[PDB]
Design a protein around this ligand. Structure first.
Ligand SMILES: O=C(O)[C@H]1O[C@@H](O[C@H]2[C@H](O)[C@H](O)[C@H](O[C@H]3[C@H](O)[C@H](O)[C@@H](O)O[C@@H]3C(=O)O)O[C@@H]2C(=O)O)[C@@H](O)[C@@H](O)[C@@H]1O
Ligand code: NA
Length: 228
């Protein structure tokens, strides 16, 4: 028997501003359904406190997608609209099973391309330095596929305990704070000026696994998004 995330108060504010995509982008449950007790192995309250996401398969997801609050439709904002767009979370990333290679846990996405992904990564070299079992940001600065279109940053090695995140977008600039420490300040987003379809996401989006059955698993102790 699985306990629903909505059975406690902690996540109601974000559930009131999200729909859930599972197991792919086009299959969704509404904010109303989430608030009404949506539950399953993919999305349940673990140990009385964690909004836990689980998903297997290449490019499959169990992921919240930002909505206008209070039964609203899909949100679309812009990096240069003047509003500060802020997402906060506290995440326990447990040990990922063999075959899971990258799990996107927070995003800024849009109708053109992902402006930002925060992901857990098993192993990667960045700017000449090898990192293992760590949290990375990937920012798009163009629409191409080569590495020149991205800025990738080692944010923090994965920790045993909960790790806090804050993503702030204001006036075409991005700041990321992890465990209270700034890890990216003033990253340019101006390529995306005028893109009015941006939105936050969070959960588990399974990227390039080497086994289709390996289940990615991510636990949120807190999640919120706000415009201010
Ligand atoms: O060394 C590198 O940086 C490796 O990057 C690989 O290309 C990445 C690309 O940089 C980026 O991470 C992209 O991200 C996509 C994501 O996985 C999801 O599919 C979706 O969110 O869309 C993202 C996007 O389009 O921005 O994924 C690719 C990738 O293949 O994983 C390769 O170039 C690799 O050879 C290289 O080592
Ligand atoms: Na765990």
């Amino acid at each position: 028997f699985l306990t629903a995330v909505s059975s406690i108060d902690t996540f109601l504010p974000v559930l009131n501003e999200a729909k859930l995509q599972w197991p792919t982008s086009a299959l969704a449950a509404s904010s109303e359904e989430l608030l009404g007790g949506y539950v399953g192995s993919q999305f349940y309250l673990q140990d009385g406190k964690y909004m836990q996401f689980q998903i297997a398969g290449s490019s499959n997801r169990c992921e919240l997608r930002q909505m206008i609050p209070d039964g609203g439709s899909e949100i679309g904002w812009a990096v240069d609209d003047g509003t500060t767009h802020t997402a906060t979370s506290s995440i326990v990333v447990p040990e990922q099973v063999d075959g899971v290679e990258e799990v996107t846990i927070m995003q800024i996405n849009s109708g053109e391309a992902p402006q930002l992904r925060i992901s857990w990564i098993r192993s990667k070299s960045l700017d000449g330095v090898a990192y293992e079992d760590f949290i990375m940001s990937t920012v798009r600065i163009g629409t191409g596929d080569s590495s020149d279109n991205f800025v990738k940053t080692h944010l923090a090695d994965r920790t045993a305990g909960a790790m806090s995140f804050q993503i702030d977008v204001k006036d075409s600039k991005l700041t990321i704070t992890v465990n209270g420490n700034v890890v990216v300040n003033g990253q340019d987003l101006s390529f995306w000026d005028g893109t009015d379809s941006c939105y936050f996401k969070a959960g588990a989006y399974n990227n390039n696994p080497t086994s289709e059955s390996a289940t990615a698993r991510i636990k949120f102790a807190a999640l919120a998004w706000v415009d201010h």
